[PDB]
Each structure stands twice: as C-alpha cells, then as structure tokens.
Amino acid sequence: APTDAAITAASDFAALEKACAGRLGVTLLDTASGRRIGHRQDERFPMCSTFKSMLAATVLSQAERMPALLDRRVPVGEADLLSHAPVTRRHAGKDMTVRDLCRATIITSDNTAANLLFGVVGGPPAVTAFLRASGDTVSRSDRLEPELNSFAKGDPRDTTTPAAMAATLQRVVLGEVLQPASRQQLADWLIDNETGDACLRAGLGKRWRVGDKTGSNGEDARNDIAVLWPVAGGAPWVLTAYLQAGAISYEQRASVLAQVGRIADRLIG
Numbered sequence: 001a002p003t004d005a006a007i008t009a010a011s012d013f014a015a016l017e018k019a020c021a022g023r024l025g026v027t028l029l030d031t032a033s034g035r036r037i038g039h040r041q042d043e044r045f046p047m048c049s050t051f052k053s054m055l056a057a058t059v060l061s062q063a064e065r066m067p068a069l070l071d072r073r074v075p076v077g078e079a080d081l082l083s084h085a086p087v088t089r090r091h092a093g094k095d096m097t098v099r100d101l102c103r104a105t106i107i108t109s110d111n112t113a114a115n116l117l118f119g120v121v122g123g124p125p126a127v128t129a130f131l132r133a134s135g136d137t138v139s140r141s142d143r144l145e146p147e148l149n150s151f152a153k154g155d156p157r158d159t160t161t162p163a164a165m166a167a168t169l170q171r172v173v174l175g176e177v178l179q180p181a182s183r184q185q186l187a188d189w190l191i192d193n194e195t196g197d198a199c200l201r202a203g204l205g206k207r208w209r210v211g212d213k214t215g216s217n218g219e220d221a222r223n224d225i226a227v228l229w230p231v232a233g234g235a236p237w238v239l240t241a242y243l244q245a246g247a248i249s250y251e252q253r254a255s256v257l258a259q260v261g262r263i264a265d266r267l268i269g
C-alpha cells in the first residue's frame with residue numbers, strides 16, 4: 001500500500017523514480033519544437049521488446065527496395081516456437097506473410113515472429129545498420145529472442161536511451177526515413193498495440209490517439225514507448241519510458257508507467 005500511494009502521489013519523474021526505488025528514464029518530446037523534458041534521458045536501458053518497433057521498420061524499409069517482400073511467406077517451424085508466440089503458435093507447420101509477422105511482433109510482441117523477421121532482414125546487424133542510417137548512433141540491436149532481453153550494467157547490447165528512442169520514433173514513425181505508406185503502416189501497428197493498456201495509455205487522456213510498444217524482462221525491466229497524436233489536430237508528441245524497478249511487482253511497474261503518462265499529460269497541458 002505505501003508504495004502504491006507513493007507512486008500515485010508522485011507529480012514529477014524524479015519523485016516517481018524515488019517512489020518505486022527504481023531507475024526511470026523518460027523523454028517527452030514535442031515534435032513541433034524539438035523540446036524534450038524527462039529524467040535520465042541519456043542513460044542506457046535495455047530495449048527488451050521495444051526494439052520490435054525498429055525491426056518492423058527495418059522490414060518496411062527493405063520492402064521499399066524489394067518488391068513484394070511484405071507478401072513473402074515464411075515457414076513457421078516447431079523449432080522456431082518460443083514460450084511467447086501468441087500468433088505464430090497457430091501456424092506451426094505452415095507459413096505466414098512477412099507483413100503478418102510484423103503485425104504480430106508489434107501488437108502481441110510475439111517472440112517467434114521477431115526471430116523469423118530477423119532471419120528475413122539479416123539479423124541484429126541489419127536492424128542496427130537501419131538505425132544508424134536513420135540517424136540513431138546510440139540504439140543497438142545485438143541478439144535474437146529471448147537472449148536480447150538481458151541487461152547488465154555497462155553492457156550496451158540491445159540498449160537504447162529514452163532520448164535516442166524518442167528521436168528515432170519521430171524520424172521513423174512521423175518523419176521521412178520511410179516512404180509515406182510504409183510509415184503509415186507502422187503507425188497503424190503501434191496504434192493497434194494490445195499489450196499496453198495498463199502502461200502509458202492508462203495515464204493519458206482521451207485527447208490523444210496513442211500508438212505504443214511495450215517491453216519487459218523477468219528481473220526488473222518494464223518499458224513503454226509511444227507516439228501521441230492529438231485527436232483535435234496539431235503536432236504529435238513522443239513519450240518514451242524505460243524502468244528498472246526490482247523492488248516492486250510487475251503490476252506495480254505498470255502503475256509507474258501509467259503515472260509517467262499522467263505526469264506527461266499534465267506537462268503538455
């Protein structure tokens with residue numbers, strides 16, 4: 001109870017970090033001005049599943065120079081299946097389109113779909129090369145599922161920073177890294193995400209149309225990265241949130257991310 005009350009009472013990111021005895025990295029980015037507010041914006045955190053947003057972007061980018069790549073069918077083998085494979089588990093022994101694998105990995109965070117897409121694009125090195133070409137010198141993809149979700153202090157594999165990921169979401173989901181139809185498809189997948197109802201979305205008011213991608217690991221990490229489109233029109237905002245908080249429960253980590261959303265909504269005003 002005391003921890004829950006301290007989380008609810010926190011009105012700024014530093015106080016919220018203290019309330020959960022964690023390490024919290026947040027960037028709130030105004031795309032009209034480039035202005036950012038946050039906490040630990042340039043510290044490294046494990047991407048965990050949040051990298052899947054950029055794996056899908058790498059696929060879409062490759063499809064712009066490989067006609068019909070999105071329609072290519074990829075076998076789903078029994079040996080490819082992992083514990084978290086909510087969509088691909090139904091297709092073991094048959095195949096799925098690249099496009100449907102992308103959707104599955106964004107909106108359900110399907111780990112098998114991510115590994116199959118890694119095989120399509122050329123692995124973590126291809127995702128990192130896409131990130132670098134897009135202008136992100138910080139974020140890096142190094143490993144496959146599920147090993148990529150590990151984190152060690154000082155080990156930069158599969159990490160980002162809140163500010164690097166916020167800028168990348170702007171360039172890729174809103175900017176000109178991808179062709180318009182490609183970026184719109186990616187935006188739609190993020191808008192359709194099914195795993196974030198208790199995270200940033202739970203703290204953001206109805207004035208925002210939200211697209212997001214979550215992530216977590218079993219030790220202490222819980223993340224959510226989001227694009228906020230004002231339903232009334234105007235410039236979008238980007239909100240990234242990376243948390244490590246081993247002293248609280250998985251469900252309390254969601255509460256922290258929801259509180260990030262409530263604080264951010266108030267700061268936008």
Ligand SMILES: *C(=O)N1C[C@H](NOS(=O)(=O)O)CC[C@H]1C(N)=O
Pocket residue numbers: 047048049050084108109110111146149195214215216217218
């Ligand atoms: C991604 O971080 N993961 C995939 C899956 N879904 O969780 S998410 O919805 O938060 O992404 C299980 C947890 C995690 C993982 N360990 O792979």
